[PDB]
């Protein structure tokens, strides 16, 4: 059923496939020669930890950039732009659709590994429902695997490579290289007829003892390229064979990129392939579509991709409220909120025409931040003059529907704290949520903006929306008001000071803009 | 199309599958210590030949017997009589049907290797139609691969056996046994997912270089268990798994045989499996059905069956004109004859009611010999006492429609010599054949039976139908046989009886029901 | 590669061409004066209908008569019998094999419009494999364009003639006659160099605004000559130039038909031309060989072939087991059947040697009916006396092989109703199609023949195969027809009592 998709894709794309054994074995032997395999063991030890940080990530990345200096099979950073040539106008619509579906699927699978999910003080059903997602995606009260300052540094660091695999099995398994090649050759042949299972690897193990090391019924989620998964072994086995149509052996180029995708959409239409609305393991169509859109120059499956920054939906653009798919990602990202924690909220613009919305939980250092186009532009210029200093031409790019979707998804029975309950009340009540209880702090003007300078020095990087000169009639310039910076400084006003805390965004950055 | 047929039978016969990996390696280890592999070489040399004689079969049977004596995994002579129990009445009706069609297909595929096909003086169409039968089945004027005294001695001698295969690759291929067990396992694993082919064997040889011994582009037809076919290698691989629903491991017993046949039928029913009415390689259903019905006790696929007598349709029977598939076997049987050669004919019983019919070709030595149930009980009795001495009770088990079908399939424009034409004329006539010219030679009473005693002395065993005491106007005389008349009327002409072993055109099973 | 074939044919057939720039306009003028273009717009309306019947075909055929009555460039009824002479015995065999291929292509493209294809309860893949087919040829469940009682009235009615195109562009486009000639000539000068496309005519229209009535897509299939296709304008623009060896201008005669055929087969041989076995539009080779073999008198491209009767393999014959080509015709003929509906089956003779075979679906009203040669005569000559009464000389001409070819082409899972089973079971099992379930209705022999004399009164003309006198053990009785048995047994279950052949009319007898 998932091997059927794979089979049809082999035939259709067989003309882009080739023998690569010599290039692979060369990289394996070069790793066997150059690489510090005790550091391979060190990175594996770090992947056994349930909780990992920046020191673990640096070690992984350093080992990644050590492998990358020794292999000749690498993918280069290449942007890709697609138009009506070769691909039909109908084909680019489908791609755009499937890519934004993929976007949702991959963000809901991988992001909670870094962003985290709240597993503390919740109802019995909610925990059961959160546990089911975290069982599925491979995963105080906030549980996460990667506690990092920059989660973008987790991109493309976890892919599996045939040559690295072949080298790792040879050194760590303590047998000759050829034995390993002749082992994955027999595995590679199982794969020409079925996706290999537990019993398959068992009986080969009797003739090739190496295949013990490999873990068969482990997931491909929350693993590195240094681990001995079923997928890494199967992939490495596909490249040792003498031909022919093995999908792993695809190379992409600017000259070949469109045709592969055109051929992918032909199979998809013939068999009814689709991007899953579920988080978890990638299906055959999800896997190929991501690996090709990741780079316009390289080998989608088997190359070195650790040099590549960004995602597949970013590295490839289509030139032509919230989607059900976006709604899902948003609803999963918000499970990061502790509903029992103290929560600030602030807005810029009048409550019935908001242009900036923020929420802030000071103890976890997690925040919601987003934007909206105004309706009353004639009133927007007034607030640009005297309050927020936002230019509307920079709000054009704000993703629509975000205002209602966040206020709808807010934890029920949460208590929101605000400097002036007035407008916040008329906002939540309007967006359908009267239930949310509100505190009024009621500070004075001098005491609310006491830590205004302190907050902008530490956190300026988190909002770039405020450009316009703001005045205060007596005219003289003042600091423009950010909705986010307001929240932080109002918490500091009450606290009596401001700590150094690395803030974590609840929303993905891909969601704020279009 | 047919790997599913296997995959489905695998799923339903699971409980009959088993672990024999050890017992095969044990039987190979015994062959490695006991078998003369130089004699294996000698038999393989005989299989490379086009024409094979009685001495080649003697060597082949002697070696098979030596293999047989050493292996612990053998099949036993166990006959099966099927009764309504585990199998429903319809299940049994389906079994009987298929065994008739299977009988036809396997006779048409195997028997011409011995019986032969005339390939001399014919129309271009007749030769192309015939040479296209030879490539379907993997095969003076007569073409044959086996020229033997008795073609029952060919039966069950050619099967493949994993332990023999295992033993032969080890000793002839000059590698250790352990590395042979390694190689076959990986092939056996592939066999779970697909039937391995050209490249599948090519790429496997790259780690295990014992596998270029095995021939890929060679069929299963016209080869012995000593040859390294893909099927023998694939078969042996199946045994290399401690588990897996492989049909090759199955054990049959008087207790389990019905239930096995029941399970096969469900798979056949479900998918729509069938016996193909075209000669050639066996389909998975034809294969399983044959091997199971040969012996009620033993291992259908993997045992030594070299000591088993009878074809599977004789060893297993159901208890509760010709069939379409009997006809195609009959038409295929007739191709042995030289249509241009000298050909005799003779009948016993009235031309309107023949009880015995025989045709004889004196040069190739081949004959048609069959019987028929009469209708004129009155005329029969006086003929019996004056001519053939055939007991009417011995004729009820004769195949009906055999007169029609044989006379039809006789080649157009043949020349028949006969003693007395009036009779032969009326029988060929009322059947569509006026095209055949008849030569009546003028042999008087005395001369036509000069070598009568000589013919019966030499050929008695060919006819057992004449038991009654025949008399002339009184004293006893020798009963008239259609076939013995044909031979002796030829003897009169030639001035001497020939000294040869005769070959039958008709499959022996086909004469009686 | 198809304009190559055009070009190459043009040079080799240069001397059977003339000019015709006078008579084309002459007949176009004789149309301007004496033809109502309201009925022409009425025809365009009818061809715009998604379903069409006998009354719409009447309005077409009468207009194909009225145009034929005025014009002096016409083809007339002329049969051709190809003998050796100019065409070597090797040319004849290549011409007989190609016309046979051509039969299979033209039938699979044009016939489904009338006969219909079932697009109801089927597997997605079937709905894929069958819609693919429709978009190639330009097309309850059964979808059809022409629903007519006589489908032979459809033949030679959709033809395209330049003069008819000329007179149509003039009156309907409201420009002067000359401006139509000026516009199409300029398109004809493009036809000497390449086959005009989307942009060719788009730029022509910039000087010739009258050329906007014309489509690039689509097509050249379920259109009539009253439409404005690309080809109609192209053919017209060819007959506007002086000389140049223009294919469209070819006139055939009983003295010249062999040499023109002799010419074609050289170019085919020299290039690699052949009759496509895939349905759709004609390649230039299919089109030339078809237009010529239609008639041996007139202008195969530009004449008034609207009163010509019978197809090109019928109107032209050669004088010296089914063919690969006919089996694909048969498989696309069995697509008409609704496999999810009440279906009968009946045969004559014994199951191991059937001489007449029938299947019938009442609700739609379609049937399968064919004959076979017997093998056993002793049994056939008795069945003739006491069951069917068919003469053996009538059974030689029946197409051999249809019996197994139809049975295998049956839909999988279909359920048959019969009277009785057993011998229907014996037949579908010899062929090895057990998957088919059988219902015996098992009526009494008197109850089976209640509506006997009624069915032979409404459907007699559908079978002319029963000649001999069938007797009962004696008195004369009405012979048994396998097809007439299908309809009467249906009536005995219905209590009461059109028909469309599933099998091609041309495939029953060879
Ligand atoms: Mn990175
Ligand atoms: Mn504010
Ligand atoms: Mn191995
Ligand atoms: Mn005699
Ligand atoms: Mn009937
Ligand atoms: Zn801001
Ligand atoms: Zn005898
Ligand atoms: Zn009839």
mmCIF file of C-alpha atoms and ligand atoms in Angstrom, chain A residues 348 356 369 371 390 456 463-466 481-485, ligand 6:
data_model
loop_
_atom_site.group_PDB
_atom_site.id
_atom_site.type_symbol
_atom_site.label_atom_id
_atom_site.label_comp_id
_atom_site.label_asym_id
_atom_site.label_seq_id
_atom_site.Cartn_x
_atom_site.Cartn_y
_atom_site.Cartn_z
ATOM 1 C CA UNK A 348 -2.395 48.131 18.993
ATOM 2 C CA UNK A 356 -1.161 44.095 16.176
ATOM 3 C CA UNK A 369 2.596 37.661 18.321
ATOM 4 C CA UNK A 371 -0.601 41.251 12.706
ATOM 5 C CA UNK A 390 3.145 50.983 11.566
ATOM 6 C CA UNK A 456 13.591 47.436 23.646
ATOM 7 C CA UNK A 463 9.312 42.947 16.322
ATOM 8 C CA UNK A 464 10.355 44.959 13.241
ATOM 9 C CA UNK A 465 6.930 46.427 12.456
ATOM 10 C CA UNK A 466 7.344 49.888 13.972
ATOM 11 C CA UNK A 481 4.314 51.231 21.079
ATOM 12 C CA UNK A 482 4.603 47.547 20.243
ATOM 13 C CA UNK A 483 1.901 45.191 21.506
ATOM 14 C CA UNK A 484 4.532 42.605 22.448
ATOM 15 C CA UNK A 485 6.969 45.030 24.111
HETATM 16 ZN ZN1 LIG D 6 5.427 45.242 17.560
#
